[PDB]
From a paper:
Kainate receptors, a subclass of ionotropic glutamate receptors, are tetrameric ligand-gated ion channels that mediate excitatory neurotransmission. Each KAR subunit has a multi-domain organization, including the amino-terminal domain (ATD), involved in receptor assembly and trafficking, the ligand-binding domain (LBD) that binds agonists, competitive antagonists and positive allosteric modulators (PAMs), the transmembrane domain (TMD), which forms an ion-conducting channel, and the carboxy-terminal domain, which determines surface expression, synaptic localization and interactions with intracellular proteins. Here we present cryo-electron microscopy structures of the kainate receptor GluK2 in the presence of the agonist glutamate and the positive allosteric modulators lectin concanavalin A and BPAM344. Concanavalin A and BPAM344 inhibit kainate receptor desensitization and prolong activation by acting as a spacer between the amino-terminal and ligand-binding domains and a stabilizer of the ligand-binding domain dimer interface, respectively.
Particles representing GluK2 with no ConA bound yielded two structures, GluK2Glu-4fold, which has a nearly four-fold symmetrical LBD layer, and an apparently asymmetric structure, GluK2Glu-asym. Both structures revealed Glu but not BPAM molecules bound to the LBDs, despite incubation of the sample with saturating BPAM concentration. Similar to GluK2Glu-4fold, the B–C subunit LBD dimer is dissociated in GluK2Glu-asym owing to a rotation of approximately 100° of the subunit B LBD. Although the A–D subunit LBD dimer in GluK2Glu-asym is preserved, the interface between protomers is severely altered compared with the GluK2BPAM and GluK2Glu–ConA–BPAM structures. Indeed, the D1–D1 interface in the A–D LBD dimer of GluK2Glu-asym undergoes rupture, resulting in marked separation of the D1 lobes compared with GluK2BPAM and GluK2Glu–ConA–BPAM. This rupture of the interface that harbours BPAM molecules in GluK2BPAM and GluK2Glu–ConA–BPAM distorts BPAM binding sites and explains why this PAM is not bound to the GluK2Glu-asym A–D LBD dimer. The states represented by the GluK2Glu-4fold and GluK2Glu-asym structures remain unresolved. Accordingly, the GluK2Glu-asym structure would then represent a semi-broken state, in which one LBD dimer has a natural desensitized conformation, and another is dissociated into monomers.
Numbering used by the authors:
A (entry chain B): 33 to 480
B (entry chain A): 97 to 240
C (entry chain D): 241 to 288
Write the structure that this text describes.
């Protein structure tokens, strides 16, 4: 019956077909309209338009043009400076500002009308911290890419007071991808542990130079940050023995999800990535994952709330819209399941603090789950405890090794404390040491 | 409403976010924007219609590094207030690559003045060479 | 295939035998730290 006009702002695609976030946004408008299970008597529509991601005034024109057209939610640009322009638009009128990109949040930025489905580095950097107790490191060498890198990892940089570490934070060179002078210093620093913190496009670009710098041995134990680690062509590195542990949010362990991803890659046969990049061809980026997961969260909101409609409000005359004060409370209370699994926002500030993760790592066959993380529970990691296989303690080489023992001093005197105990420590002495001293060398569980 | 009124020298807010709006206003129309507090560059913005007279933290964070060299410290315990302040010190955080400094970065608590648990932890940690990084209204309250 | 199986460190040393080692695409391996000391009889250090 109603159209519930969406739209927003996306990347300008100067001569290419369309940017990968914008394909997901139209694919999200499509998919709900076919499957009528979501949305009774409505359809959806979109007014997409491009900016240069650095011109906030271009964003602030192109936002209020859609507001003067009248929207139901601006889905926002994908850049820090262009966010806060359109952020302050949606604070002013009451329309929601569903985001798909981590921006710097100003500490005193008293806003209400926004969410951002990209998982917060308040939580995410605790997870990277959660590994370095698990991998039992001491000597992390965090590598950020630009000045907004060192603000993301602030819960990691505030480690060494506790969980004791030794941080040696160094920086990728600006204005190029020539990490050869950077990596050469890391080799002579013997820095065998490093938390590369960049996009997946950089994460191919450093490894492909870290492969030529001889940095890809069985010693080095990389950890990435980017949530498209499962998009690297990891194939050349795979036999070498490098432990590039990481994360993903995109749950490929669902049939319904992975059906869409291959339904996706048939649609985005358009715009193939060039081959020498070090990147794959058919892959959901986690931005286009969150963009497609976003419009569901708004679609389940308008399922939960009928009678919501479109007025046309104008930035020239600052006026609160009508419905957002109701409707923003609908969005912030949502529990949709999607490509990123358990979307659940925060009834405080409109972020995403509760979310599930897979920890994927490079074993010799490829990328492979080695457990699951969430804000509770720490690292639930299916280690599949070694020392089992079809055995216990070789079961016949170590039957009980029953030893014929006489008590004689100082050889076997007697081991007493009080309150009769048992085991091999019923006796003590020179030979009782020579029981365990012959046992410490070879290895046999013995019995008196 | 100053631009349509007709001006020549917009002198801008004193904040991060509201600067970058009015800067991109000043890029399009052509009028010079002139800043007074340090804001966070995004390093990939093609805007060149702006100046900023706040002393840049490119060189301040380097000047602090020389002054910690002078005192020949080892155990600096860098303390900031807002997450912008860590960016304002980058030449100091990258220093343990170069030198034998050993930082322990620790944060003034949010939504408050109460720097007791900082100084509670700071005394027992036996650190004595602490750098603060906070506004001077804030800064006097720590020494109280 | 030594490169894809991580044996191109600063630890290894591959003396080749062939007399065409100079004419080999040594550009990706160069920075790493293998020392592929080989041979040549071709005398490219002479102008004529
Ligand atoms: C570093 O990597 C090696 C191999 O790349 C790890 O060894 C494991 O070895 C077993 C064989 O017994 C393989 O089946 C496993 O797949 C390997 N695990 C992984 C994660 O690759 C070794 O444990 C790793 N060590 C560190 C400190 O990272
Ligand atoms: C439409 O989505 C619902 C989930 O709400 C699902 O149960 C149903 O199977 C979907 N329809 C089709 C045709 O896939
Ligand atoms: C709209 O959907 C409702 C179910 O909520 C159904 O009862 C009705 O027949 C549909 N069509 C119209 C025209 O209302
Ligand atoms: C909401 O966000 C705050 C700040 O990050 C966090 O501490 C809190 O736990 C969140 N609320 C929930 C429900 O976790
Ligand atoms: C997670 O839960 C417990 C430990 O937290 C463990 O027994 C279980 O196997 C783990 N994995 C799954 C998939 O539940």
């Amino acid at each position: 019956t109603h159209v519930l006009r969406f739209g927003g702002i996306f990347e300008y695609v100067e001569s290419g077909p369309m940017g990968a976030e914008e394909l997901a946004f139209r694919f999200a408008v499509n998919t709900i309209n076919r499957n009528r299970t979501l949305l009774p008597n409505t359809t959806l529509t979109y007014d997409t338009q491009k900016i240069n991601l650095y011109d906030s005034f271009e964003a602030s024109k192109k936002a209020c043009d859609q507001l003067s057209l009248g929207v139901a939610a601006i889905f926002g640009p994908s850049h820090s400076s262009s966010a806060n322009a359109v952020q302050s638009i949606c604070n002013a009128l009451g329309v929601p500002h569903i985001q798909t990109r981590w921006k710097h949040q100003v500490s005193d930025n008293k806003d209400s009308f926004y969410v951002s489905l990209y998982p917060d580095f308040s939580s995410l950097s605790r997870a990277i911290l959660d590994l370095v107790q698990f991998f039992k490191w001491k000597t992390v060498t965090v590598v950020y890419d630009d000045s907004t890198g060192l603000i993301r990892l602030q819960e990691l940089i505030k480690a060494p007071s506790r969980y004791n570490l030794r941080l040696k934070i160094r920086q990728l060179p600006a204005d190029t991808k020539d990490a050869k002078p950077l990596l050469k210093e890391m080799k002579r620093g013997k820095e065998f542990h490093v938390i590369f913190d960049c996009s997946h496009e950089m994460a191919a670009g450093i490894l492909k130079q870290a492969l030529a710098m001889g940095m890809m041995t069985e010693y080095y134990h990389y950890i990435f940050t980017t949530l498209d680690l499962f998009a690297l062509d990891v194939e050349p590195y795979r036999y070498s023995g490098v432990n590039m542990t990481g994360f993903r949010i995109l749950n490929t362990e669902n049939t319904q999800v992975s059906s869409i991803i291959e339904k996706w890659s048939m649609e985005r046969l358009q715009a193939p990535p060039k081959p020498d990049s070090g990147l794959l061809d058919g892959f959901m980026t986690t931005d286009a994952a969150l963009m497609y997961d976003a419009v569901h969260v708004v679609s389940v909101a308008v399922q939960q709330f009928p009678q919501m409609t479109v007025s046309s409000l104008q930035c020239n005359r600052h006026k609160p819209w009508r419905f957002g004060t109701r409707f923003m409370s609908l969005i912030k209370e949502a529990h949709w399941e999607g490509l990123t699994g358990r979307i659940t926002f925060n009834k405080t500030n409109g972020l995403r603090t509760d979310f599930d993760l897979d920890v994927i790592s490079l074993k010799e066959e490829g990328l492979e789950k080695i457990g699951t993380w969430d804000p509770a529970s720490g690292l639930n990691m299916t280690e599949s405890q070694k020392g089992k296989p079809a055995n216990i303690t070789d079961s016949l080489s170590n039957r009980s090794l029953i030893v014929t023992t006489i008590l004689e001093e100082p050889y076997v005197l007697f081991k007493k404390s009080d309150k009769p105990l048992y085991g091999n420590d019923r006796f003590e002495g020179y030979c009782i040491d020579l029981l365990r001293e012959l046992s410490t060398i070879l290895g046999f569980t013995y019995e008196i």
